[PDB]
Amino acid sequence: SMSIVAQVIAQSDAADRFLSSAEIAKLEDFFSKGQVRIRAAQKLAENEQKIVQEGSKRFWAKCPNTPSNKGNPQKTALCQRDQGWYIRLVSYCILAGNDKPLEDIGLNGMREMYISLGVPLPNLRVAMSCLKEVAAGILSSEEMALAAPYFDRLIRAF
Amino acid sequence: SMSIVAQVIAQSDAADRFLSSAEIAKLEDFFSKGQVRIRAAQKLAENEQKIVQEGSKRFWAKCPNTPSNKGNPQKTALCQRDQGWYIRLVSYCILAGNDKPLEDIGLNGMREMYISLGVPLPNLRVAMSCLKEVAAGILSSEEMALAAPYFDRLIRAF
Amino acid sequence: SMSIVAQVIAQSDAADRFLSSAEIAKLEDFFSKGQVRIRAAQKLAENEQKIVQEGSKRFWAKCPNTPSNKGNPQKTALCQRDQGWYIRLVSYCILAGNDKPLEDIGLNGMREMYISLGVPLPNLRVAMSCLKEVAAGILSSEEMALAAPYFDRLIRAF
Amino acid sequence: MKDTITSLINPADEKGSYLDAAALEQLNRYFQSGNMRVKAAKTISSSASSIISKTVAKSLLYGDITLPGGNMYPTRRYAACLRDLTYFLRYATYAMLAADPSILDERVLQGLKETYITLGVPIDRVIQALNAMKEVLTESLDTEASQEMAVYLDHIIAGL
Amino acid sequence: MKDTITSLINPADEKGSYLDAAALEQLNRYFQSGNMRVKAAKTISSSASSIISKTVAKSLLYGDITLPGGNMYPTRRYAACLRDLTYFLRYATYAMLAADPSILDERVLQGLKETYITLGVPIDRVIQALNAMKEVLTESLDTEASQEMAVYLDHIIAGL
Amino acid sequence: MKDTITSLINPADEKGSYLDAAALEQLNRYFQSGNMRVKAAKTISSSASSIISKTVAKSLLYGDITLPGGNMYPTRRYAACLRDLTYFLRYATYAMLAADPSILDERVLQGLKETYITLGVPIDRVIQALNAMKEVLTESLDTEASQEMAVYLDHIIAGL
Ligand SMILES: *[C@H](C)[C@H]1/C(=C/c2[nH]c(/C=C3N=C(/C=C4\NC(=O)C(CC)=C4C)C(C)=C\3CCC(=O)O)c(CCC(=O)O)c2C)NC(=O)[C@@H]1C
Ligand SMILES: *[C@H](C)[C@H]1/C(=C/c2[nH]c(/C=C3N=C(/C=C4\NC(=O)C(CC)=C4C)C(C)=C\3CCC(=O)O)c(CCC(=O)O)c2C)NC(=O)[C@@H]1C
Ligand SMILES: *[C@H](C)[C@H]1/C(=C/c2[nH]c(/C=C3N=C(/C=C4\NC(=O)C(CC)=C4C)C(C)=C\3CCC(=O)O)c(CCC(=O)O)c2C)NC(=O)[C@@H]1C
Ligand SMILES: *[C@H](C)[C@H]1/C(=C/c2[nH]c(/C=C3N=C(/C=C4\NC(=O)C(CC)=C4C)C(C)=C\3CCC(=O)O)c(CCC(=O)O)c2C)NC(=O)[C@@H]1C
Ligand SMILES: *[C@H](C)[C@H]1/C(=C/c2[nH]c(/C=C3N=C(/C=C4\NC(=O)C(CC)=C4C)C(C)=C\3CCC(=O)O)c(CCC(=O)O)c2C)NC(=O)[C@@H]1C
Ligand SMILES: *[C@H](C)[C@H]1/C(=C/c2[nH]c(/C=C3N=C(/C=C4\NC(=O)C(CC)=C4C)C(C)=C\3CCC(=O)O)c(CCC(=O)O)c2C)NC(=O)[C@@H]1C
Ligand SMILES: [Cl-]
Ligand SMILES: [Cl-]
Ligand SMILES: [Cl-]
């Protein structure tokens, strides 16, 4: 029950009834712009790395006091890795129609992991804000209208 | 455990004891008027069809908006069939001393069947009321004193 | 596992361990006064009949409304038989070191047997009380200190 | 367990027909058995302990079966025999009131002979106690009530 | 239950990669199935009782199965058949909307054949009613919607 | 398992008689065995591990049976031998306290010889360890207590 269709079917099956008009309304809004979802996920996959370095530059301008900006390249590589991983989790949510790929994979237990690692949370605030701004410059006006709830959801978890 | 004697024996056997005075009182009232029960079941069998057409006429007078009164004779025949079947289930209850032939055969799942068939339930209200009135005119004063709890039970299930 | 030694061994064997100090304490108290047990069982065997008639006289004085005191000598003989049987079951418990010869032979299903026979239970109350008082007059101070738990156990079962 | 009324009403329901004249006729004579079967079941249900006491007192007592070595010694074996005879009387009364020995076969007479042979219970003494139970019931019930209880106790005897 | 979107998103998450071009391509054609599957699920969810009524009225009624001795006699057996066909329609609609017959296998077709053989339910009549359900859905849905419901009802038929 | 008291009380109950003078006499000399059997069972129950350690240390150790190829190699086979000797000591103590070797036959010596022959366990070494167990018990118990434990260990030896 990760995707929106499976959740709709699981809510209807639990109540031993057919698909109510609210659930038809939810699946109408998911499947009407499903070409945009394929296009947005393909675009986020296609130029992941361009987004990641162009957001890392803006993030190191807006926050130079990071564990990434400490000289050694391997914490920097782990930060670039995390930026790409969170863009992948945003693309999964664009495809799934709900933020449950971002909650189950990305945000469940994220705070405990980052506080133990020593990565500050305002640093991740501004990192995912810069990543959102770069991806807004990349995607479109209306593919970003799909992605921006999930980028906002990711940003708000820090 | 359809008949009253078998239910009495099943209640006494479950409690590992002999027949209590309430159960002797119930079997006294069943077996005292058991000649009337044989006579009533034989009479309901004997002129089933007279009751069914004479009640169908009164029912089509009191309710002309039936699936039976739609011209084609085969829904009409299925209605006459059901009237005879429910008179047979009433006679089984007269013989058994309880309404368990009517519940197990006739009323369990009856509403789902008739709502799926498209037969209205006020139509069956008035059909079994007219069938009761005709059978009251047929049986006696006191054979009908046996049948009228079961006809009322059948009527109340619609 | 009727005797106390067999029960001690069965409790130790079930727990896959040797003899605990509680069980050594129980077998110390059983075997220290085991000469008294042989003497008491031999004395109860030796003058059974003296106890039985001398207790029957006191019991017919204290309760004349018995099935024994109804003239015919054969219910009287069955009562004398039962008094001797229960003295034998007391002697088995003196030898065994526990009241399990009295429970398994004498008291298991005793109440159902005596209620079906028509022998009243206060009659047996007072019969075994008089039998205890006579055997206290017979045995000793300290052989009766062994028998009196088992006579009390027999008395309390009525 | 199937009684007389259900064993006629059920095949009429499988056929979807009324009770035909043969089955309704054999039901009618059951319905005028009727009040006497209920009268016998009332007499037995109040005086069941007395019936069992008289049954034991004229077939099993005052002999070697209640003495040591017998199978009604000690009190536990006596109590087991007493509740066995109470089972036999209660299920014969059920089968008499139902006019059908089917409750005697799926509640009483199933593995009972093998149980008694394994246990060492003397089946001839059980049969002799059931024969005395018939004589006890003859002196306490009405005339044809005793005969029907005799039929339903002979079914237990023949099963044993 | 796994649907089409989860069955592609989950292996990409185990791999830690994006949806590659084959899986994203087969997801894309599911996304332009899409609005018609939702339109068919809307049509079925409002008119489910009518679909079941028409399915029974052209495959099961007016014969010997609803007469005494049949397996749709008495009313309890009719009601059981009716809710069975409603289960079949609802889970076929779920499997059509999901584009995946996995919900038909772990909710419907598991022990069902053995249940029907033990119960005495005529499986050929069930299959014939499902064949009539396909014809009822053909006259009420759109063209390829009927074909996809036919696929997901044939999965129940082949499991039965 | 039947001990000495039950093996006398039970036939008196089957006969329905008291304990006659022969059985009550042979019970009396068991009752003045008595406190010494309990004293020996107390000594063994506290020092059982020490008894088994001394039994192994003078019959089984410092040879080729605990070296590779021996049947007390590796540690699993040593532990199995150790709990076997603990079984032998515990059931001999039970049979001594009961004054009856019946618990040695239905708990210990039943299929044991065939078990050891199938397993390859050297029965002569087991018998030699039981012979050393008797010498260990002789140095730790009283005089006739050691003799009765010797009888009940010879019963295991003769069964093996
Ligand atoms: C970069 C935007 C920010 C930051 C990053 C940083 N991250 C790490 C180390 C790790 N990061 C993760 C991340 C995840 N595990 C998951 O399951 C998910 C969701 C799918 C994520 C995002 C993990 C597991 C590690 C541990 C190392 C490893 O992967 O083996 C570090 C290194 C910290 C350290 O002590 O080594 C850093 C520096 N740093 C910044 O400045 C940015 C705010
Ligand atoms: C007449 C009083 C009313 C009514 C009747 C009507 N009935 C039917 C069709 C069917 N009726 C049944 C009935 C029963 N099945 C049972 O097990 C029992 C209890 C023993 C009963 C009463 C069934 C199974 C059917 C289906 C057809 C068949 O038997 O094969 C119809 C036809 C409806 C249709 O769509 O064909 C009708 C019209 N109609 C009235 O107007 C009266 C209120
Ligand atoms: C005398 C103290 C009391 C009493 C006695 C009485 N007893 C009986 C008849 C029977 N008593 C027994 C007793 C036992 N069976 C056992 O297994 C044991 C324990 C080992 C006991 C004590 C039995 C079996 C009978 C049945 C007859 C028989 O043995 O064959 C009676 C006769 C009752 C009757 O209806 O015949 C009587 C009168 N009566 C008293 O007044 C005293 C209280
Ligand atoms: C008295 C008639 C004779 C007798 C009886 C006796 N029976 C048993 C033990 C058992 N009796 C039954 C019988 C039934 N159990 C049921 O549920 C029913 C039907 C409702 C019946 C008929 C069974 C199954 C047993 C074995 C299990 C148990 O004991 O409960 C005993 C006891 C045997 C024993 O060793 O204790 C006895 C003594 N024996 C006679 O000598 C009388 C002639
Ligand atoms: C109508 C199509 C045919 C028919 C049907 C019939 N079925 C049953 C009883 C049962 N049906 C099921 C099936 C399911 N239960 C579920 O939860 C699901 C999936 C969601 C399915 C598919 C089961 C398990 C049973 C047995 C338990 C129960 O009765 O509830 C019956 C009743 C049988 C009876 O003896 O009462 C019937 C009549 N029979 C026909 O003849 C029609 C062709
Ligand atoms: C030491 C004395 C000698 C020896 C012992 C040895 N025994 C076994 C394995 C088994 N021992 C038993 C014996 C018993 N189990 C019981 O419950 C009881 C009574 C309470 C007894 C007496 C059994 C049944 C087995 C087989 C099952 C099992 O292993 O548990 C072994 C192990 C053999 C193996 O291959 O592992 C050994 C080594 N062997 C010697 O050489 C010593 C002289
Ligand atoms: Cl019992
Ligand atoms: Cl149902
Ligand atoms: Cl081991």
Pairs of CB atoms within 8 A across B/D? 105
The CA E58 to ligand 2 mean position distance, Å, reads 15
The CA E88 to ligand 5 mean position distance, Å, reads 11
Residue E109 DSSP class? S
Sequence-distant (≥ 6) Cβ neighbours of residue D98 within 8 angstroms: B5, B6, B9, D1, D3, D4
Dist CA C109 CA D23 (whole Å): 48
Partnered with residue F70 across adjacent β-strands are F68
Residues B107 and B157 sit within 8 Å (Cβ to Cβ)? yes
Q: Entry resolution in angstroms? A: 2.9
Residue of D nearest to F13 (CA): D68
Whether E71 is in the pocket of ligand 5, judged by its Cβ within 6 Å, is yes
Angle between helices C121-138 and C48-62 (to 10 degrees): 130
**Cβ of A28: how many Cβ atoms within 10 Å?**
15
Instruction: Read off the amino acid at residue C110.
Output: M
Q: Give CA angle at C105 (C101, C109), nearest 5°.
A: 135
For residue C2, say whether it is annotated as part of any ligand binding site.
no
Sequence-distant (≥ 6) Cβ neighbours of residue C114 within 8 angstroms: C121, C124
Ligand 3 atom nearest residue D63's Cα = 30
For residue B68, say whether it is annotated as part of any ligand binding site.
yes
For residue A16, say whether it is annotated as part of any ligand binding site.
no
Backbone dihedral region of E110: left (phi > 0), alpha (psi from -120 to 50 degrees) or beta? beta
Sequence-distant (≥ 6) Cβ neighbours of residue A24 within 8 angstroms: E38, E41, E42, E45
3-state helix, strand and coil shares in percent for chain C, rounded to the nearest 5: 75, 0, 25
Dist CA B83 CA B93 (whole Å): 16
Ligand 6 atom nearest residue F87's Cα = 20
Residues of chain D neighbouring E67 (CB-CB closer than 8 A): 16
Q: Compute the nearest-CA separation of E55 from chain B (Å).
A: 11
Q: Where are the domains of chain A?
A: 1-158
Those chains having 3 or more beta-carbon pairs within 8 angstroms of chain B are D, E
What is the set of domains in chain F, with CATH numbers? 33-159 (1.10.490.20)
Report the run of H or E that residue A117 belongs to, with start and end.
helix A110-117
Residue of D nearest to E69 (CA): D14
Residue E92: name the closest of E78, E77, E105, E79 by CA. Answer: E105
State the Cα torsion C47-C50-C51-C55 to the nearest 10°.
180
Sequence-distant (≥ 6) Cβ neighbours of residue E27 within 8 angstroms: A38, A95, E4, E5, E8, E19
Residue of E nearest to D12 (CA): E68
Residue E44: name the closest of E96, E101, E109, E100 by CA. Answer: E96
Residue with tokens 């040879």: F63
Residue of C nearest to D47 (CA): C116
Does B101 sit within 8 Å of D9, measured CB to CB?
Answer: yes
Q: Compute the nearest-CA separation of E67 from chain A (Å).
A: 30
Structure tokens at A139: 């995607």
Portion 1-30 of F in contact with D at CB < 8 A: 13-16
Residue F44: name the closest of C12, C15, C35, C4 by CA. Answer: C12
Instruction: Read off the amino acid at residue B152.
Output: D
Residue A66 DSSP class? S
Residues near ligand 4 (Cβ within 6 A) = D 65, 71-72, 77, 80-81, 84-85, 87, 107-108, 112, 115, 119, 121-122, 125-126, 129
Q: Whose CA is nearest to atom 34 of ligand 3?
A: C117
Ligand 2 atom nearest residue B126's Cα = 43
D27, with CB counted inside 10 A (0-12, 13-18, 19+), is: buried
Residues B41 and B136 sit within 8 Å (Cβ to Cβ)? no
Partnered with residue D68 across adjacent β-strands are D70
Does F13 sit within 8 Å of D69, measured CB to CB?
Answer: no
Half-sphere exposure of C84 (CA within 13 A, CB side): 17
* For chain D, counts of helices (H) and of strands (E): 8, 0
Q: Give CA angle at F84 (F81, F85), nearest 5°.
A: 90
Residue A72 phi/psi, 5° resolution?
-75, 135
Whether B106 is in the pocket of ligand 2, judged by its Cβ within 6 Å, is yes
Residue of E nearest to A39 (CA): E28
Residues of chain F neighbouring C1 (CB-CB closer than 8 A): 1, 6
Residues B19 and D42 sit within 8 Å (Cβ to Cβ)? yes
What 3-state class would DSSP assign to A34? helix
For residue C79, say whether it is annotated as part of any ligand binding site.
yes
Residue F16's alpha-carbon distances to C45, D56, E31, in angstroms, are 12, 22, 92
Q: Whose CA is nearest to atom 36 of ligand 6?
A: F77
Helix/strand/coil (H/E/C) assignment for every residue in chain F: CCCCCHHHHHHHHHHCCCCCHHHHHHHHHHHCCCHHHHHHHHHHHHCHHHHHHHHHHHHCCCCCCCCECECCCCHHHHHHHHHHHHHHHHHHHHHHHCCCHHHHCCCCCCCHHHHHHHHCCCHHHHHHHHHHHHHHHHCCCCHHHHHHHHHHHHHHHHHC
Q: Does F76 touch chain D (CB under 8 A)?
A: no
Residue D141: name the closest of D26, D22, D54 by CA. Answer: D54
**Which of the ligands is closest to the CA of residue F81?**
6
For residue C16, say whether it is annotated as part of any ligand binding site.
no
Sequence-distant (≥ 6) Cβ neighbours of residue B156 within 8 angstroms: none
DSSP C28-86: HHHHTTHHHHHHHHHHHHHTHHHHHHHHHHHHHHH---SSSSSS-HHHHHHHHHHHHHH
Residues of chain D neighbouring B91 (CB-CB closer than 8 A): 18-19
Residue E131: name the closest of E104, E105, E97, E160 by CA. Answer: E160
Instruction: Read off the amino acid at residue D48.
Output: A
Sequence-distant (≥ 6) Cβ neighbours of residue D117 within 8 angstroms: D123
Residues B86 and B106 sit within 8 Å (Cβ to Cβ)? yes
State the Cα torsion A89-A93-A98-A100 to the nearest 10°.
-30
Q: Which of C5, C42, C105 sits opposite F24 (nearest CB)?
A: C42
Dist CA F55 CA F129 (whole Å): 6
**Cβ of B149: how many Cβ atoms within 10 Å?**
14
Dist CA A89 CA E12 (whole Å): 10
Does C88 sit within 8 Å of F17, measured CB to CB?
Answer: yes
Does D67 sit within 8 Å of F15, measured CB to CB?
Answer: no
Dist CA B124 CA B83 (whole Å): 10
Report the run of H or E that residue A1 belongs to, with start and end.
none
Dist CA F56 CA F125 (whole Å): 11
Ligand 2 atom nearest residue E73's Cα = 17
Backbone dihedral region of C10: left (phi > 0), alpha (psi from -120 to 50 degrees) or beta? alpha
Pairs of CB atoms within 8 A across A/E? 104
Residues of chain E neighbouring D16 (CB-CB closer than 8 A): 67-69, 73
Residue with tokens 């199938």: F118
At CB < 8 Å, which residues of chain B contact D?
A: 1-6, 8-10, 12-13, 18-21, 24, 27-28, 31-32, 34-35, 37-38, 41-42, 44-45, 48, 85, 88, 91-92, 95-97, 101, 105
Structure tokens at D90: 């209660």
Whether E126 is in the pocket of ligand 5, judged by its Cβ within 6 Å, is yes
Residue F70 phi/psi, 5° resolution?
-80, 170
Which of E64, E76, E77, E133 would you mutate first to test chain B, the one with the most B CBs within 10 A? Answer: E76
Residue C130's alpha-carbon distances to C56, C127, F76, F102, in angstroms, are 8, 5, 65, 42
* Contact flag for D and C (3+ C-beta pairs < 8 Å): yes
Dist CA F141 CA F150 (whole Å): 11
Q: Does D82 touch chain C (CB under 8 A)?
A: yes
Partnered with residue D70 across adjacent β-strands are D68
Dist CA C52 CA A106 (whole Å): 91
Structure tokens at B118: 């498209």
Residue E71: name the closest of E129, E8, E137 by CA. Answer: E129
Whether E69 is in the pocket of ligand 2, judged by its Cβ within 6 Å, is no
Does F98 sit within 8 Å of C38, measured CB to CB?
Answer: no
Residues B98 and B4 sit within 8 Å (Cβ to Cβ)? yes
Sequence-distant (≥ 6) Cβ neighbours of residue B70 within 8 angstroms: none
At CB < 8 Å, which residues of chain A contact E?
A: 1-6, 8-10, 12-13, 18-21, 24, 27-28, 31-32, 34-35, 37-38, 41-42, 44-45, 48, 85, 88, 91-92, 95-97, 101, 105
Those chains having 3 or more beta-carbon pairs within 8 angstroms of chain F are C, D
Residue C40's alpha-carbon distances to C30, C48, C99, C101, in angstroms, are 14, 12, 15, 16
What 3-state class would DSSP assign to B103? helix
Dist CA D108 CA D87 (whole Å): 8
Structure tokens at F69: 């190829």
The dihedral built from the CA positions of residue C101, C102, C103 and C109, taken in this order, carries a sign that is positive
What 3-state class would DSSP assign to D68? strand
The CA F84 to ligand 6 mean position distance, Å, reads 6
Residues E23 and E8 sit within 8 Å (Cβ to Cβ)? yes
